[PDB]
Design a protein around this ligand. Structure first.
Ligand SMILES: Nc1nc2c(ncn2[C@@H]2O[C@@H]3COP(=O)(O)O[C@H]3[C@H]2O)c(=O)[nH]1
Ligand SMILES: Nc1nc2c(ncn2[C@@H]2O[C@@H]3COP(=O)(O)O[C@H]3[C@H]2O)c(=O)[nH]1
Ligand SMILES: Nc1nc2c(ncn2[C@@H]2O[C@@H]3COP(=O)(O)O[C@H]3[C@H]2O)c(=O)[nH]1
Ligand SMILES: Nc1nc2c(ncn2[C@@H]2O[C@@H]3COP(=O)(O)O[C@H]3[C@H]2O)c(=O)[nH]1
Lengths: 192, 192, 192, 192
């Protein structure tokens, strides 16, 4: 029950923080829902727990939590299992709410995202497109080191895994040939 | 009430610390007032709270807390809202007390400051000048990478937002043309 | 008794974490045993404790904990005691469970391991070999900066001390001639 | 009383830690005395407290705690007060016990020390020399980037302030001419 207690107490700290900065009612309701969707009423010192484990256990855990995400993406499903583990280990779980700008067009992109669950809207000057479970986006800038070619907003609640450009290149340093998978997707999107 | 408790307990740690290092009465009174003005009797693990949020929520919070500061500075008011958010996100809130040397002339400058509320005195060999709400200072060294051209002391209590030279250049890396706003101010001040 | 309490409470956090991610029974049993073997039912803020000490005390502690490991390895036993201390200070204690892949062949190696207690199985295309107390492995890649030449799996429970490639080169920067000890072992293994 | 409580509880964690690693009685007595001399039965989250303050207050505190140390060293007493503050701010308080090797001859030196209180013995092949309150040592390697020219052991309990080579050069980057003070001392010692 110590996990729920930590959540309850922590959220109390949040309410007091929002009250201190006099945040509007609608904004506090948004913060409240984010915490609900993101932690589901439970909190553990994850960093501390995973830090107490060893490489093998941490890799087994991330592989288990991402089993579905993996089987749904040919990128991971047909790849060297060691490549998948290397990738998964670098991912950061993030939750975005409806309407949130995940990626803003024209800005310098330093991360890409894998959709665990949810729907995002991609806008290039017109013609909106949707991406859902099993797809990823934001790879163009990690490859070009340029500026975002489109904006991406969350349509539904989005449970995503982000990957920094540095971690992206680090993993590909060990698995150079996997860069082509990302380039194929980037090329196909740029020629659309 | 957990926010006040944290403050009360933390300040008790401070009193004991000052007692341990045998700090003079006037000095302890100064420390006491700083804590009062800086935290207003409440403390939350801000870093932890903001770290639990996502990019969107953190950006919405800083934009809200700095709404007034922003509208008061043509620098931000007339700029790309994304530039403002990028800037705001890098700021560090700091409180200075009357008489405090914020900037000492002749030293290597590695930060600039935006005045949220308060009055600072700028001294160049003579002719003191005042700056208040809505103005910023310390930009000359961020642009020249040289030495402070004047000293700056807090006149009243000062609620400021500092920006490191590294964060300054990082943001301008994405918004190169905004550097001119700072240069215009630096030029006008150097030619005075 | 505060050390046992910390363990008990921390492990409770683990059980709740594993329950939250719905980990399988066998997996939770594995995690349970790892914690048992790794902490033996006791936990202290080691980093904090050692951080409160000074260089001399920390060096005396690591030398004491590794006295046996040292006397068993000519590498340390016959070396400059200052070299040993420099090395020991960089080691990270790790526990691996039966069947765990400590090193996977073909991957980029960034660490080596010293066996405190346990048996590991080294597999090169065939001909498995065993290494035990007093031996070390993983040195080839720290010297070549290439890819692992063999896989290494824990046979029994393994209590090991790992050394990162950066810490390895850092220590050897001060004790350049000790690199030969590692090269002799790497050469002998590569010519087998 | 919360400062004493933190010490008492923390030291209890230490006793349990030493018991867990089965440290010898004499060693535990040494650890016990170190904690006594170093914290004098009181502990506060100093890093947290100073982190809550601002530049001015932190500088005023370190200047106050080091007032005596400063007036005793012409290096600081006759220097630009801003140079002193810059230096003091980089110092790390450390306590060494009788017989402790502060500096070992022939090793790569990355720090120097200022004696707040205590006596150290400097050994070059023979002719031992003593240094006490108001003196500093270890500057030769910070200037040469070579190897220690002598060993330095604590004679009495030593309350020292260490300065890393990086922080040393950083401060001197802003106060280039102060490097000569250290060179004069290094030259005089090398020609002895
Ligand atoms: N340019 C472009 N990007 C798309 C399209 N569909 C999805 N995207 C993704 O939207 C992302 C926006 O940021 P990036 O430019 O880094 O990468 C882009 C692609 O990953 C498309 O049709 N055209
Ligand atoms: N040199 C100069 N600086 C001024 C003047 N008015 C305000 N300032 C600010 O005082 C600051 C002191 O530090 P910097 O030289 O970095 O930047 C300086 C300016 O931002 C002025 O009239 N002359
Ligand atoms: N190539 C090879 N490695 C061995 C042998 N015996 C033990 N090893 C160790 O197994 C390790 C696997 O990773 P490295 O290639 O870095 O270093 C290897 C050696 O340290 C052997 O016979 N051949
Ligand atoms: N070489 C030398 N060092 C001395 C002497 N007296 C004090 N020392 C200090 O002992 C220190 C040992 O480490 P360093 O060589 O870095 O710097 C040395 C000096 O700071 C002396 O007479 N000769």
């Amino acid at each position: 029950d110590s996990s729920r207690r930590q959540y309850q107490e922590k959220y109390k700290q949040v309410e007091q923080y929002m009250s201190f900065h006099k945040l509007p009612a609608d904004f506090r309701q948004k913060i409240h829902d984010y915490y609900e969707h993101r932690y589901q009423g439970k909190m553990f010192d994850e960093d501390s727990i995973l830090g107490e484990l060893n490489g093998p256990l941490r890799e087994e855990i991330v592989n288990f939590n991402c089993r579905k995400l993996v089987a749904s993406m040919p990128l991971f499903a047909n790849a060297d299992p060691n490549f998948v583990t290397a990738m998964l280990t670098k991912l950061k779980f993030e939750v975005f709410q409806p309407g949130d700008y995940i990626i803003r067009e024209g800005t310098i992109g330093k991360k890409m995202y894998f959709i665990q669950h949810g729907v995002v809207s991609v806008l290039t000057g017109n013609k909106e497109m949707k991406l859902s479970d099993g797809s990823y986006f934001g790879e163009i800038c990690l490859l070009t080191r340029g500026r975002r070619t489109a904006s991406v907003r969350a349509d539904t609640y989005c449970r995503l895994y982000s990957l920094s450009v540095d971690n992206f290149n680090e993993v590909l340093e060990e698995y150079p040939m996997m860069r082509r998978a990302f380039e194929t997707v980037a090329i196909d999107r740029l020629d659309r």
